[PDB]
């Protein structure tokens, strides 16, 4: 009974899938019989088969994704990768707060169970806030929140089993952190955005490729006028672009009314911040 469905996640938390016929975070399409990976902030991973799903259809419905998992308290899911086959040369890519990445076959996550199991030991304090896959020629990008940088190659991290911890990635000063992880596919810019409402773009091509565990270039000029680095992603021209506010305020903006400059700018105000409101969300929107 296998044919392709719309399997949609809500900013909110909801889940359900059905055959073709809050707000949207996520809209895919896939087969009955494929598989979704969901990673979370402590390290573990689960699986279930699509069909496995809850099948609500039509508008509205669904169950929360928090009650299909046996998570713990403060436990969030960081990414969710959709897999049709484990072929034999990809990789699953890892990347922690602390600076730590790693990285592991494909093939040991072929026969997980819907209870979990531990993709990345953790030591107390760090988390996990990214994943992805990788092959081949790929590079990684790794961002932190002082308006850090560094780019390299996944071949000179080395692969290892799903109980480890995993290298060092990029070195950070003293109360920094990582904030998003990017493995560049393409000639679309790359947009960062902060507390206080700044944003701005910068080709991709301006991004100096380096070595891994080093302390990296600037990416952007923080002050206490922008404030932190909220996050960083990859898109393109027909784009746009979602940031959300601790106070709830939302606003969209198409990525080709936003100036590229260089790496050395502080960019310009994007969103009325107004005093004691962050931004701290920063995303493409569902297409």
Do not use: W
């Amino acid at each position: 009974t296998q044919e392709d469905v719309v399997v949609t996640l809500s900013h909110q938390g909801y889940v359900k899938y059905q055959p073709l016929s809050d707000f949207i975070d996520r809209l895919l399409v896939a087969n009955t019989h494929d598989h979704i990976l969901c990673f979370s902030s402590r390290g573990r991973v689960y699986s279930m088969k699509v069909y496995q799903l809850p099948e609500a259809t039509r508008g509205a419905r669904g169950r929360p994704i928090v009650n299909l998992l046996p998570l713990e308290q403060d436990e969030r899911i960081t990414a969710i990768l959709p897999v049709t086959e484990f072929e034999e040369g990809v990789k699953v890519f890892m990347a922690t707060a602390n600076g730590t990445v790693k990285k592991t076959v494909l093939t040991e996550f072929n026969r997980l169970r819907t209870a979990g199991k531990v993709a990345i030991k953790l030591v107390d304090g760090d988390e996990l806030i990214g994943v992805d896959l990788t092959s081949g020629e790929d590079e990684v990008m790794l961002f932190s929140a002082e308006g850090k940088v560094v780019r390299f190659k996944e071949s000179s991290v080395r692969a290892m089993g799903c109980n480890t911890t995993g290298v060092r990635g990029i070195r950070l000063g003293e109360g920094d952190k990582v904030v998003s992880l990017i493995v560049p596919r393409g000639d679309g810019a790359i947009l960062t955005a902060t507390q206080n409402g700044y944003g701005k773009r910068t080709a991709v091509a301006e991004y100096p490729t380096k070595s891994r565990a080093t302390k990296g270039v600037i990416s952007i000029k923080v002050t206490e006028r922008n404030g932190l680095v909220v996050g960083a992603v990859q898109v393109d021209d027909c784009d746009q672009i979602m940031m959300i506010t601790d106070a709830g305020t939302l606003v969209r903006t198409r990525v080709s009314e936003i100036s590229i400059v260089g790496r050395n700018t502080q960019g310009v105000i994007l969103i009325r911040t107004a005093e004691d409101e962050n931004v701290v969300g920063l995303q493409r929107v569902a297409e």
